[PDB]
Coordinates of C-alpha atoms and ligand atoms in Angstrom, one line a residue:
Chain B
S1 CA -2.9 16.9 -1.2
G2 CA -4.7 13.6 -0.6
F3 CA -4.0 11.0 2.1
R4 CA -3.4 7.3 1.4
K5 CA -2.4 4.2 3.4
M6 CA 1.1 4.4 1.9
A7 CA 3.8 1.7 2.2
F8 CA 7.5 2.3 2.0
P9 CA 9.1 1.7 -1.4
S10 CA 9.9 -2.0 -1.2
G11 CA 13.0 -2.2 -3.5
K12 CA 15.6 -2.3 -0.8
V13 CA 13.8 -5.3 0.8
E14 CA 13.1 -7.1 -2.5
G15 CA 16.8 -7.4 -3.0
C16 CA 17.1 -9.4 0.3
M17 CA 14.4 -12.0 -0.3
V18 CA 15.4 -15.6 -0.8
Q19 CA 13.7 -18.9 -0.8
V20 CA 14.7 -21.4 2.0
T21 CA 13.8 -25.1 1.8
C22 CA 14.5 -27.8 4.4
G23 CA 13.2 -31.2 3.7
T24 CA 9.8 -30.7 2.1
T25 CA 9.1 -27.2 3.7
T26 CA 9.8 -24.0 1.7
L27 CA 9.4 -20.5 3.0
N28 CA 11.0 -17.1 2.7
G29 CA 14.3 -15.9 4.1
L30 CA 16.0 -12.5 4.4
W31 CA 19.6 -12.4 3.1
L32 CA 21.5 -9.5 4.8
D33 CA 25.3 -9.5 4.5
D34 CA 26.4 -13.2 4.7
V35 CA 23.4 -14.4 6.8
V36 CA 20.0 -15.6 5.8
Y37 CA 17.3 -15.3 8.5
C38 CA 14.1 -17.3 8.4
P39 CA 11.4 -18.8 10.7
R40 CA 12.8 -21.8 12.5
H41 CA 9.7 -23.9 11.6
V42 CA 11.2 -24.3 8.1
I43 CA 12.7 -27.5 9.8
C44 CA 9.3 -28.9 10.7
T45 CA 7.0 -31.3 8.8
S46 CA 3.2 -31.0 9.3
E47 CA 3.3 -33.7 12.1
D48 CA 6.1 -31.7 13.9
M49 CA 4.0 -28.5 14.2
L50 CA 1.6 -30.0 16.8
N51 CA 4.3 -29.7 19.5
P52 CA 7.8 -29.3 18.0
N53 CA 11.0 -29.8 19.9
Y54 CA 13.0 -27.4 17.8
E55 CA 16.3 -28.3 19.4
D56 CA 15.9 -32.0 18.5
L57 CA 14.6 -31.3 15.1
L58 CA 17.5 -28.9 14.3
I59 CA 20.0 -31.5 15.5
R60 CA 18.9 -33.8 12.6
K61 CA 19.8 -31.0 10.1
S62 CA 23.2 -30.2 8.6
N63 CA 24.2 -27.1 6.5
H64 CA 23.6 -29.0 3.2
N65 CA 20.0 -29.7 4.2
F66 CA 19.2 -25.9 4.0
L67 CA 18.6 -25.0 0.4
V68 CA 18.8 -21.3 -0.2
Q69 CA 18.1 -19.8 -3.6
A70 CA 18.2 -16.1 -4.3
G71 CA 16.1 -15.9 -7.4
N72 CA 17.9 -18.2 -9.8
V73 CA 21.2 -18.6 -7.9
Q74 CA 22.0 -21.0 -5.1
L75 CA 23.7 -20.0 -1.9
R76 CA 26.2 -22.2 -0.1
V77 CA 25.4 -22.7 3.6
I78 CA 28.4 -22.8 5.8
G79 CA 26.8 -22.6 9.3
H80 CA 23.4 -22.7 11.0
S81 CA 22.2 -21.5 14.4
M82 CA 18.9 -21.0 16.0
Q83 CA 18.3 -17.8 17.9
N84 CA 14.9 -17.8 19.6
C85 CA 12.3 -18.6 16.8
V86 CA 14.6 -17.7 13.9
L87 CA 17.2 -19.7 12.1
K88 CA 20.4 -17.9 10.9
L89 CA 22.1 -19.6 8.0
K90 CA 25.6 -18.3 7.4
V91 CA 26.3 -18.3 3.7
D92 CA 29.6 -18.0 1.9
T93 CA 28.6 -14.9 -0.1
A94 CA 27.5 -11.5 1.2
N95 CA 24.3 -10.2 -0.5
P96 CA 25.5 -7.6 -2.9
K97 CA 22.1 -5.9 -2.6
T98 CA 22.3 -5.6 1.2
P99 CA 21.0 -2.1 2.0
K100 CA 22.1 -0.1 5.2
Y101 CA 19.9 -1.8 7.8
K102 CA 19.1 -2.2 11.5
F103 CA 17.0 -4.7 13.5
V104 CA 14.4 -3.0 15.6
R105 CA 11.7 -4.2 18.0
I106 CA 8.8 -2.0 17.4
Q107 CA 6.3 -0.9 20.0
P108 CA 2.5 -1.7 19.8
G109 CA 0.7 1.0 17.9
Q110 CA 3.7 1.6 15.6
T111 CA 3.3 1.1 11.8
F112 CA 5.4 -0.7 9.2
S113 CA 5.3 -2.0 5.7
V114 CA 5.1 -5.7 4.9
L115 CA 6.5 -7.2 1.7
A116 CA 4.4 -10.3 1.2
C117 CA 6.5 -13.0 -0.5
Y118 CA 6.0 -16.5 -1.7
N119 CA 8.8 -18.9 -2.6
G120 CA 11.3 -16.1 -2.2
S121 CA 9.4 -13.9 -4.7
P122 CA 7.7 -10.6 -3.7
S123 CA 4.0 -10.4 -4.5
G124 CA 2.9 -7.2 -2.9
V125 CA 3.5 -4.5 -0.3
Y126 CA 1.1 -2.9 2.3
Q127 CA 1.2 -0.8 5.4
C128 CA -0.2 -2.0 8.7
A129 CA 0.1 -1.4 12.4
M130 CA 1.3 -3.6 15.2
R131 CA -2.0 -3.9 17.2
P132 CA -1.8 -3.1 20.9
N133 CA -2.3 -6.9 21.4
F134 CA 0.9 -7.7 19.3
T135 CA -0.9 -9.2 16.4
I136 CA -1.1 -7.8 12.9
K137 CA -4.0 -8.0 10.5
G138 CA -2.1 -8.8 7.3
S139 CA -2.7 -10.7 4.1
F140 CA -0.7 -13.9 4.4
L141 CA -1.3 -17.2 2.6
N142 CA 0.5 -20.6 3.1
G143 CA 4.2 -20.0 2.1
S144 CA 4.2 -16.3 3.2
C145 CA 6.2 -17.4 6.3
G146 CA 9.4 -15.4 6.5
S147 CA 7.9 -12.3 4.8
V148 CA 9.2 -9.2 6.7
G149 CA 8.0 -5.9 8.0
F150 CA 10.1 -2.8 7.9
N151 CA 10.4 1.0 8.0
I152 CA 12.9 3.1 6.0
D153 CA 14.6 6.3 7.1
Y154 CA 16.3 7.7 3.9
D155 CA 18.8 4.9 3.1
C156 CA 18.4 2.7 6.2
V157 CA 15.9 -0.1 6.4
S158 CA 14.9 -1.0 10.0
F159 CA 13.5 -4.5 9.9
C160 CA 11.0 -5.0 12.7
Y161 CA 8.9 -8.1 11.8
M162 CA 9.2 -11.6 10.4
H163 CA 6.0 -13.5 9.7
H164 CA 5.5 -16.8 11.5
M165 CA 1.9 -17.8 11.7
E166 CA -1.9 -17.2 11.5
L167 CA -3.9 -17.7 14.6
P168 CA -7.3 -19.6 14.3
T169 CA -9.0 -16.1 14.3
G170 CA -7.3 -15.1 11.1
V171 CA -4.9 -12.5 12.5
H172 CA -1.1 -12.8 12.2
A173 CA 1.8 -13.3 14.6
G174 CA 5.5 -13.1 14.2
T175 CA 8.8 -12.1 15.6
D176 CA 11.4 -9.4 15.6
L177 CA 14.6 -10.3 13.6
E178 CA 16.2 -11.8 16.8
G179 CA 13.3 -14.3 16.7
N180 CA 11.4 -13.1 19.7
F181 CA 7.7 -13.2 19.2
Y182 CA 5.6 -10.0 19.6
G183 CA 3.0 -11.0 22.1
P184 CA 2.5 -14.2 24.0
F185 CA 2.7 -16.5 21.0
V186 CA 4.7 -19.6 20.5
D187 CA 5.5 -21.2 17.1
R188 CA 3.2 -24.2 17.5
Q189 CA -0.1 -25.4 15.9
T190 CA -2.2 -24.9 19.0
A191 CA -5.0 -22.4 19.6
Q192 CA -3.5 -19.3 21.3
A193 CA -5.3 -16.4 22.8
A194 CA -4.4 -12.9 21.5
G195 CA -5.2 -10.4 24.2
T196 CA -8.1 -7.9 24.2
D197 CA -7.2 -5.5 21.5
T198 CA -7.9 -1.7 21.6
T199 CA -7.9 1.1 19.1
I200 CA -4.7 3.2 18.9
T201 CA -6.0 6.5 20.1
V202 CA -2.9 8.6 19.3
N203 CA -3.1 7.3 15.7
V204 CA -6.8 8.1 15.3
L205 CA -6.1 11.7 16.5
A206 CA -3.1 11.9 14.1
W207 CA -5.4 10.8 11.3
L208 CA -8.1 13.4 12.3
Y209 CA -5.3 16.0 11.9
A210 CA -4.4 14.6 8.5
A211 CA -8.1 14.9 7.6
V212 CA -8.2 18.6 8.6
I213 CA -5.0 19.3 6.6
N214 CA -6.5 17.6 3.6
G215 CA -9.9 19.4 3.7
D216 CA -12.2 17.0 5.7
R217 CA -13.3 19.2 8.6
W218 CA -17.0 18.4 9.2
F219 CA -16.1 16.7 12.5
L220 CA -14.6 19.8 14.1
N221 CA -16.8 21.1 16.9
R222 CA -17.1 24.0 19.4
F223 CA -16.1 21.7 22.3
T224 CA -13.0 20.9 24.3
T225 CA -12.3 18.2 26.9
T226 CA -9.6 17.2 29.4
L227 CA -7.3 14.1 29.4
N228 CA -9.3 12.7 32.3
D229 CA -12.7 13.2 30.6
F230 CA -11.5 12.0 27.3
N231 CA -10.0 8.9 28.9
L232 CA -13.4 8.0 30.5
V233 CA -14.8 8.0 26.8
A234 CA -11.7 6.1 25.6
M235 CA -12.3 3.4 28.2
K236 CA -15.9 3.0 27.3
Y237 CA -15.1 2.6 23.6
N238 CA -12.0 0.3 24.0
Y239 CA -9.6 3.0 23.0
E240 CA -6.0 3.2 24.4
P241 CA -5.8 5.8 27.3
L242 CA -4.2 9.0 26.0
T243 CA -1.1 10.1 27.9
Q244 CA 0.9 13.4 27.9
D245 CA 3.5 11.5 25.8
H246 CA 0.9 11.0 23.1
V247 CA -0.2 14.7 23.4
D248 CA 3.5 15.6 23.0
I249 CA 4.0 13.6 19.8
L250 CA 0.8 15.2 18.3
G251 CA 2.4 18.7 19.0
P252 CA 3.6 19.3 15.4
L253 CA 0.1 18.5 14.0
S254 CA -1.5 20.7 16.6
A255 CA 0.9 23.5 15.7
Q256 CA 0.4 23.1 11.9
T257 CA -3.4 23.2 12.1
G258 CA -3.8 25.5 15.1
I259 CA -6.2 22.9 16.7
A260 CA -5.2 22.2 20.3
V261 CA -4.8 18.4 21.1
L262 CA -7.6 18.5 23.6
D263 CA -9.9 20.2 21.1
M264 CA -9.2 17.4 18.7
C265 CA -9.9 15.0 21.6
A266 CA -13.3 16.6 21.9
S267 CA -14.0 16.0 18.2
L268 CA -12.9 12.3 18.6
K269 CA -15.1 12.1 21.8
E270 CA -18.1 13.3 19.8
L271 CA -17.4 10.9 16.9
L272 CA -17.2 8.0 19.4
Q273 CA -20.5 8.9 21.1
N274 CA -22.4 9.8 17.9
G275 CA -20.7 7.9 15.1
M276 CA -20.1 9.4 11.6
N277 CA -23.8 9.8 10.7
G278 CA -23.3 8.4 7.3
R279 CA -20.3 10.7 6.5
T280 CA -16.7 9.8 5.7
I281 CA -13.3 11.1 6.7
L282 CA -10.4 10.6 4.2
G283 CA -12.5 8.0 2.3
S284 CA -13.2 6.0 5.5
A285 CA -16.5 5.3 7.3
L286 CA -14.7 4.3 10.5
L287 CA -12.0 5.8 12.7
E288 CA -8.6 4.9 11.2
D289 CA -5.8 4.0 13.6
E290 CA -3.0 2.7 11.2
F291 CA -1.3 6.1 10.8
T292 CA 1.1 7.3 13.5
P293 CA 1.7 11.1 14.1
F294 CA 5.1 10.5 12.3
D295 CA 3.4 8.9 9.3
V296 CA 1.0 11.9 9.0
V297 CA 3.9 14.4 9.2
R298 CA 6.0 12.4 6.6
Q299 CA 3.2 12.0 4.1
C300 CA 1.9 15.6 4.6
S301 CA 5.5 16.9 4.1
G302 CA 6.7 14.5 1.3
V303 CA 9.6 12.8 3.0
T304 CA 11.6 10.6 0.6
Chain L
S1 CA -5.9 -15.4 4.9
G2 CA -6.5 -11.7 5.3
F3 CA -7.2 -9.1 2.6
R4 CA -5.3 -5.9 2.2
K5 CA -5.1 -3.0 -0.3
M6 CA -1.9 -4.3 -1.6
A7 CA 0.5 -2.4 -4.0
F8 CA 2.9 -4.1 -6.4
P9 CA 6.5 -4.4 -5.1
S10 CA 8.0 -1.0 -6.3
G11 CA 11.6 -2.0 -6.8
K12 CA 11.6 -2.3 -10.5
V13 CA 10.1 1.2 -10.8
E14 CA 12.4 2.7 -8.1
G15 CA 15.3 1.9 -10.4
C16 CA 13.8 4.1 -13.2
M17 CA 13.2 7.2 -11.2
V18 CA 15.2 10.3 -12.0
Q19 CA 15.0 14.0 -11.2
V20 CA 14.4 16.4 -14.2
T21 CA 15.1 20.1 -13.8
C22 CA 14.5 22.8 -16.5
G23 CA 15.1 26.4 -15.5
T24 CA 13.8 26.6 -12.0
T25 CA 11.2 23.8 -12.2
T26 CA 12.1 20.3 -10.9
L27 CA 10.0 17.2 -11.1
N28 CA 10.3 13.4 -11.6
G29 CA 11.2 11.5 -14.7
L30 CA 11.1 7.9 -15.7
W31 CA 14.3 6.6 -17.3
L32 CA 13.7 3.5 -19.5
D33 CA 16.4 2.4 -21.9
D34 CA 18.0 5.6 -23.2
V35 CA 14.9 7.9 -22.8
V36 CA 13.6 9.9 -19.9
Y37 CA 9.9 10.6 -19.8
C38 CA 8.4 13.5 -17.8
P39 CA 5.5 15.9 -17.8
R40 CA 6.0 18.6 -20.4
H41 CA 5.1 21.4 -17.8
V42 CA 8.7 20.9 -16.4
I43 CA 9.4 23.7 -19.0
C44 CA 7.0 26.2 -17.4
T45 CA 7.4 28.8 -14.9
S46 CA 4.4 29.7 -12.5
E47 CA 3.4 32.5 -14.9
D48 CA 3.4 30.1 -17.9
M49 CA 0.9 27.6 -16.3
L50 CA -2.1 30.0 -16.6
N51 CA -2.2 29.4 -20.4
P52 CA 1.0 27.8 -21.7
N53 CA 1.9 27.6 -25.3
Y54 CA 4.1 24.5 -24.9
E55 CA 5.4 24.6 -28.5
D56 CA 6.8 28.1 -28.0
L57 CA 8.1 27.4 -24.5
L58 CA 9.9 24.2 -25.7
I59 CA 11.5 26.1 -28.6
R60 CA 13.4 28.2 -26.1
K61 CA 14.9 25.1 -24.6
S62 CA 17.9 23.1 -25.8
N63 CA 19.2 19.7 -24.7
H64 CA 21.6 21.2 -22.2
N65 CA 18.7 23.1 -20.4
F66 CA 17.3 19.7 -19.2
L67 CA 19.2 18.6 -16.1
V68 CA 18.6 14.9 -15.5
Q69 CA 20.1 13.3 -12.4
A70 CA 19.6 9.6 -11.5
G71 CA 20.3 9.6 -7.8
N72 CA 23.8 11.1 -7.6
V73 CA 24.8 10.7 -11.4
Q74 CA 24.1 13.1 -14.2
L75 CA 22.7 12.0 -17.5
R76 CA 23.8 13.6 -20.8
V77 CA 20.8 14.8 -22.9
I78 CA 21.3 14.3 -26.6
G79 CA 17.7 14.9 -27.8
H80 CA 14.3 16.2 -26.7
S81 CA 10.8 15.8 -28.1
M82 CA 7.3 16.5 -27.0
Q83 CA 4.7 13.8 -27.5
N84 CA 1.3 15.0 -26.4
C85 CA 1.8 16.2 -22.7
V86 CA 5.1 14.3 -22.1
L87 CA 8.6 15.3 -22.9
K88 CA 11.0 12.5 -24.0
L89 CA 14.6 13.3 -23.3
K90 CA 17.0 11.0 -25.2
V91 CA 20.1 10.4 -23.0
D92 CA 23.4 8.9 -24.0
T93 CA 23.2 6.0 -21.5
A94 CA 20.6 3.2 -21.3
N95 CA 19.3 2.7 -17.8
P96 CA 21.1 -0.4 -16.5
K97 CA 18.1 -1.0 -14.2
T98 CA 15.5 -0.9 -17.0
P99 CA 13.0 -3.7 -16.2
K100 CA 11.1 -5.5 -19.0
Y101 CA 8.3 -3.0 -19.6
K102 CA 5.3 -1.9 -21.7
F103 CA 3.3 1.2 -21.9
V104 CA -0.4 0.6 -21.5
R105 CA -3.5 2.8 -21.4
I106 CA -5.7 1.4 -18.7
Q107 CA -9.5 1.4 -18.6
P108 CA -11.5 3.3 -16.0
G109 CA -12.2 1.0 -13.1
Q110 CA -8.8 -0.8 -13.4
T111 CA -6.3 -0.5 -10.6
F112 CA -2.6 0.2 -10.3
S113 CA 0.1 1.1 -7.9
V114 CA 1.6 4.5 -7.7
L115 CA 5.2 5.2 -6.6
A116 CA 5.0 8.7 -5.1
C117 CA 8.3 10.5 -5.7
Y118 CA 9.8 13.8 -4.9
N119 CA 13.0 15.2 -6.5
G120 CA 13.5 11.8 -8.2
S121 CA 13.4 10.0 -4.9
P122 CA 10.7 7.4 -4.0
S123 CA 8.7 8.2 -0.9
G124 CA 5.9 5.6 -0.8
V125 CA 3.8 3.2 -2.8
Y126 CA 0.0 2.8 -2.8
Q127 CA -2.7 1.0 -4.8
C128 CA -5.6 2.9 -6.3
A129 CA -8.2 2.8 -9.0
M130 CA -8.7 4.9 -12.1
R131 CA -12.1 6.4 -11.3
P132 CA -14.9 6.0 -14.0
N133 CA -14.4 9.8 -14.5
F134 CA -10.7 9.4 -15.2
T135 CA -9.4 11.0 -12.1
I136 CA -7.4 9.2 -9.3
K137 CA -7.7 10.0 -5.6
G138 CA -4.0 9.9 -4.8
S139 CA -1.6 11.4 -2.3
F140 CA 0.5 14.0 -4.2
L141 CA 2.2 17.1 -3.0
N142 CA 4.0 19.8 -5.1
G143 CA 7.0 18.1 -6.8
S144 CA 5.2 14.7 -7.1
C145 CA 4.6 15.5 -10.8
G146 CA 6.1 12.7 -13.0
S147 CA 5.4 10.0 -10.4
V148 CA 4.1 6.9 -12.2
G149 CA 1.4 4.3 -11.9
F150 CA 2.0 0.7 -13.0
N151 CA 1.0 -2.9 -12.8
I152 CA 3.5 -5.9 -12.8
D153 CA 2.9 -9.3 -14.4
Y154 CA 5.9 -11.5 -13.2
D155 CA 8.9 -9.7 -14.7
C156 CA 7.0 -7.1 -16.8
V157 CA 6.1 -3.6 -15.6
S158 CA 3.2 -2.1 -17.5
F159 CA 3.3 1.7 -16.9
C160 CA -0.1 3.2 -17.2
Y161 CA 0.0 6.6 -15.5
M162 CA 2.2 9.6 -15.1
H163 CA 1.1 12.3 -12.6
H164 CA 0.5 15.8 -13.9
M165 CA -1.8 17.8 -11.7
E166 CA -4.3 18.3 -8.9
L167 CA -7.7 19.7 -9.7
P168 CA -9.1 22.4 -7.4
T169 CA -11.3 19.6 -5.9
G170 CA -8.2 17.8 -4.6
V171 CA -8.4 14.8 -7.0
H172 CA -5.6 13.9 -9.4
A173 CA -5.2 13.9 -13.2
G174 CA -2.5 12.6 -15.4
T175 CA -1.6 10.9 -18.7
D176 CA -0.6 7.5 -20.1
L177 CA 3.1 7.2 -21.0
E178 CA 2.4 8.6 -24.5
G179 CA 1.3 11.8 -22.8
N180 CA -2.4 11.5 -23.5
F181 CA -4.5 12.6 -20.6
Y182 CA -7.0 10.3 -19.0
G183 CA -10.2 12.2 -19.1
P184 CA -11.0 15.7 -20.5
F185 CA -8.1 17.4 -18.7
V186 CA -5.5 19.8 -20.1
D187 CA -2.2 20.7 -18.5
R188 CA -3.1 24.2 -17.5
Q189 CA -3.9 26.1 -14.3
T190 CA -7.5 26.6 -15.0
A191 CA -10.5 25.1 -13.1
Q192 CA -11.6 21.9 -15.0
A193 CA -14.7 19.8 -14.4
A194 CA -14.2 16.1 -13.8
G195 CA -17.3 14.2 -14.9
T196 CA -19.9 12.7 -12.5
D197 CA -18.1 9.8 -10.9
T198 CA -19.7 6.4 -10.1
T199 CA -18.8 3.4 -8.0
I200 CA -17.1 0.5 -9.8
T201 CA -19.8 -2.1 -9.4
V202 CA -17.7 -5.1 -10.6
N203 CA -15.0 -4.2 -8.1
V204 CA -17.4 -4.0 -5.2
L205 CA -18.8 -7.4 -6.1
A206 CA -15.2 -8.8 -6.4
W207 CA -14.5 -7.4 -2.9
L208 CA -17.7 -9.0 -1.6
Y209 CA -16.3 -12.3 -2.9
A210 CA -12.9 -11.6 -1.2
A211 CA -14.9 -11.0 2.0
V212 CA -16.7 -14.3 1.8
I213 CA -13.4 -16.1 1.1
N214 CA -11.7 -14.5 4.1
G215 CA -14.6 -15.2 6.5
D216 CA -16.9 -12.0 6.4
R217 CA -20.2 -13.5 5.4
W218 CA -22.9 -11.6 7.4
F219 CA -24.1 -9.8 4.3
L220 CA -25.0 -13.0 2.4
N221 CA -28.8 -13.3 2.2
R222 CA -31.5 -15.7 0.9
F223 CA -32.3 -13.5 -2.1
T224 CA -31.4 -13.3 -5.8
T225 CA -31.9 -10.6 -8.4
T226 CA -31.7 -10.1 -12.2
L227 CA -29.2 -7.9 -14.2
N228 CA -32.2 -5.6 -14.9
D229 CA -33.4 -5.3 -11.4
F230 CA -29.9 -4.9 -10.0
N231 CA -29.2 -2.1 -12.5
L232 CA -32.3 -0.2 -11.4
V233 CA -30.7 -0.2 -7.9
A234 CA -27.2 0.6 -9.3
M235 CA -28.7 3.6 -11.2
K236 CA -30.3 5.0 -8.0
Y237 CA -27.1 4.6 -6.0
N238 CA -24.7 6.0 -8.7
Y239 CA -23.1 2.6 -9.3
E240 CA -21.9 1.6 -12.8
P241 CA -24.4 -0.6 -14.7
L242 CA -23.4 -4.3 -14.5
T243 CA -23.0 -6.0 -17.8
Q244 CA -22.6 -9.7 -18.8
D245 CA -18.9 -8.9 -19.4
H246 CA -18.6 -8.0 -15.7
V247 CA -20.5 -11.2 -14.7
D248 CA -18.1 -13.1 -16.9
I249 CA -15.0 -11.7 -15.2
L250 CA -16.5 -12.6 -11.8
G251 CA -16.9 -16.2 -12.9
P252 CA -13.8 -17.6 -11.1
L253 CA -14.9 -16.0 -7.8
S254 CA -18.4 -17.3 -8.3
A255 CA -17.0 -20.8 -9.0
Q256 CA -14.6 -20.7 -6.0
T257 CA -17.3 -19.6 -3.5
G258 CA -20.3 -21.3 -5.0
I259 CA -22.2 -18.0 -4.9
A260 CA -23.9 -17.2 -8.2
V261 CA -23.0 -13.7 -9.4
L262 CA -26.7 -12.6 -9.3
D263 CA -27.0 -13.9 -5.7
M264 CA -24.0 -11.7 -4.8
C265 CA -25.8 -8.9 -6.7
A266 CA -28.8 -9.4 -4.3
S267 CA -26.4 -9.1 -1.3
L268 CA -25.0 -5.8 -2.8
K269 CA -28.6 -4.6 -3.5
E270 CA -29.5 -5.2 0.1
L271 CA -26.4 -3.4 1.3
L272 CA -27.1 -0.4 -0.9
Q273 CA -30.7 -0.2 0.3
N274 CA -30.0 -0.8 4.0
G275 CA -26.4 0.2 4.6
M276 CA -24.0 -1.8 6.8
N277 CA -26.0 -1.3 10.1
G278 CA -22.8 -0.5 12.0
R279 CA -21.0 -3.6 10.8
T280 CA -17.8 -3.9 8.7
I281 CA -16.6 -6.0 5.8
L282 CA -12.8 -6.6 5.5
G283 CA -12.1 -3.8 8.0
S284 CA -14.2 -1.3 6.0
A285 CA -17.5 0.5 6.9
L286 CA -18.2 1.3 3.3
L287 CA -18.4 -0.6 0.0
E288 CA -14.9 -0.8 -1.4
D289 CA -14.4 -0.5 -5.2
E290 CA -10.6 -0.4 -5.5
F291 CA -10.1 -4.2 -6.0
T292 CA -10.7 -5.7 -9.4
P293 CA -11.8 -9.3 -9.8
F294 CA -8.2 -10.0 -11.0
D295 CA -6.8 -8.3 -7.9
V296 CA -9.0 -10.5 -5.7
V297 CA -7.9 -13.7 -7.5
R298 CA -4.2 -12.7 -7.4
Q299 CA -4.2 -11.8 -3.7
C300 CA -6.4 -14.8 -2.7
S301 CA -4.0 -17.2 -4.7
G302 CA -0.6 -15.6 -3.8
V303 CA 0.6 -14.6 -7.3
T304 CA 4.2 -13.3 -7.2
Ligands
Q69_1 C1 3.7 -19.3 7.8 C2 2.8 -20.4 8.5 O1 1.7 -20.2 8.7 N1 3.5 -21.5 8.8 C3 2.8 -22.7 9.3 C4 3.5 -23.9 8.9 O2 3.6 -24.0 7.4 C5 2.8 -22.6 10.9 C6 1.7 -23.3 11.6 C7 1.7 -23.2 12.9 C8 2.6 -22.4 13.6 C9 3.6 -21.8 12.9 CL1 4.9 -21.0 13.8 C10 3.7 -21.9 11.6
Q69_2 C1 2.5 18.2 -10.4 C2 1.8 19.6 -10.4 O1 0.8 19.8 -9.7 N1 2.3 20.5 -11.2 C3 1.8 21.9 -11.3 C4 3.0 22.8 -11.6 O2 4.1 22.7 -10.6 C5 0.7 22.0 -12.3 C6 -0.2 23.0 -12.2 C7 -1.3 23.1 -13.1 C8 -1.4 22.2 -14.2 C9 -0.4 21.3 -14.3 CL1 -0.4 20.2 -15.7 C10 0.7 21.2 -13.4

C-alpha cells in the first residue's frame, strides 16, 4: 500500500537526450533512430525571440551550424527541416539506445512524466498533468527547452510533449513531437493568455478512490447525487463537468471498492462545499487532480 | 521557474534491477559488479515470516536454489552470504550496466528517490524523505521487496535504501545496502512500533525559501524570532528542534533571497500558529518537508 505521485522510469528516455547548439543557443534534443528533434527556437538569438521569422532565420543555417552532442560524442548532421515548431535534424547514425516509441498528442487532463534536462543531461523526473487549458505546471529553468514528456506501456515510450517556453505567469507551454503547440501558444517572447483553467474532476474522483483503497476513508458519507446535481457544484467550483464517459472510465475503481461513482461524487460534492476541515487525504490538504483513473489502477495493481 | 517533487533520473538504477527467486518467493535484487543484493526474507515461506531463524533457513539453501534473472537472461550463482538482513549472491558475470556507485547510510530527514520494481521490472520512480522515525511513506505492493532508494551526484549513484516491509500502519521499513535496518525494525511478521514522528523543520524552511524564489511570498511577514522562541513553537507542533547546523545549511538560500533564517522562522512560526487560511504554497495546502536545502539549491540551479 501507499500512494505516491509516481513518474515512469526515465531510463529509456535518458538514452535519447542530446545537446543541440546553433550559434550561441544551446538546448536539448531527442535522438530517435537517425533524427534529432528539438525546439525550432534553437536558431534564435535573444533579439530574434521578440517576433521571429523562423523561415528566414532557418534559411541562414546549414547542416554544419547544428552542433549535436550525445554525451561526449558528436553527431554528423546530414539534413534539417522544420515541422511546425520543431526542427528535425537528420543525423548519419541511428541512436543505438532508441527504445520502441510512438509520438502521441495527449488530451487535456491526461498525465505524463517529464525528464528535465539541461545541456543534454538529465537532472530529474516528475509526473504532471496537461491542464485543461493546455499548460503544464512544471519545473523548468533556462536551458530546459527541448526536455520531453512521455508515458511508457511495457517497452513502448509514447512521447507526448516537448518543452518550449515559460509564460509570464510561470506556467509552461510546449508542443507534441510534430511541433504543434498544446493550446493557443506561439513560440515568441510576447505575453500570451492561457485560458481559464479548471480542476480535472475525473482525476480527483480517481484519487478519492485511491484514498479509499489505501485506507483514507473519512470523507465517505451517507449521501448520493446525480450527474446533473454534481455538475451544478462542479460549475460553481471551477471543476470540469463530469460526463458518462468519465463515469465509464471510473468503472474499475467503482467495482474494486464497491462505491458507486455517483456516491463518490457526493463525497466530492461535500468536500467542495465544506473543505477538508483540517484533515488530509493521501498526504494532501487539497483535492489532487494529477492522477488519472488509469494511473490509479496501474499504481494500485503494480504494473511494470 | 516552478518547483516539483523531483526524483533522480532512474536509468542508472534500472540497469541494475534483477528478479531473485528462492523456492516459491520472488522479489527484486540489485546487481552491482558480480554481486546481487536482495532482502534475506527471499528464503522464507509465509509460515517462516512469523518468527524466522534466518541462519537455519539459509543453511537449507545452496547456490543453485537462488534463481537470478536480469530481464530475459539467467545469472549463474557461485556464492551466497548473509550480511545483516541482506543476502549477497555472488554471480559469475559482472553487470555490464553497473554505474559508478557507493553504499551510504542516510540520516533521518534526508531525501532520496525510490525505483519501485516488481519481478525485477521497474514500474515507477518517486522522491521521498527518510522520516525522523526511520520509516518512509512509499508506494509498495507485494513483490516490491528489494526495490532501492538512491541519490545521484553527476555519475555516481549512492544507494541508501532497500525495501523490506510494510508495517501494519501502512508505512515502510527497510535497510541500508549492508542490510542494517533504519530504525528499530526487524524482518519479521510481528506488529512493530515506529517511534513518534516529527516534521523535518529544516526541510520546511528550505521549501519556504523555494516558494519565495518561485514567487509564492504571501507568508512573508514583518516579524523575526530567536532559535529559542522558534523551538518552543516547534515543540508544540511536533517539529524537529532547529539547530545552528540547520541554520548553517540554509545559508545559501538565505543569501540568495536576502531573507535571514530567523526571519523565515518567524514566517514558519506564524504559519504553524495560524494555518494557511485557505491559501497554498507551491501547490500545497500543508507545510512540505520532503525537500532538503540541498534539493532546493539543486532544483533552483538546474544541477544535472
Ligand atoms: C526554453 C525557453 O524558455 N526558451 C526561451 C529562449 O531561450 C524562449 C522564450 C520565449 C519563447 C520561446 Cl518559444 C522560448
Ligand atoms: C516486501 C514485503 O513486504 N515482504 C513480506 C514477505 O513477502 C514481509 C513480511 C513481513 C516482514 C518482512 Cl521483512 C517482509
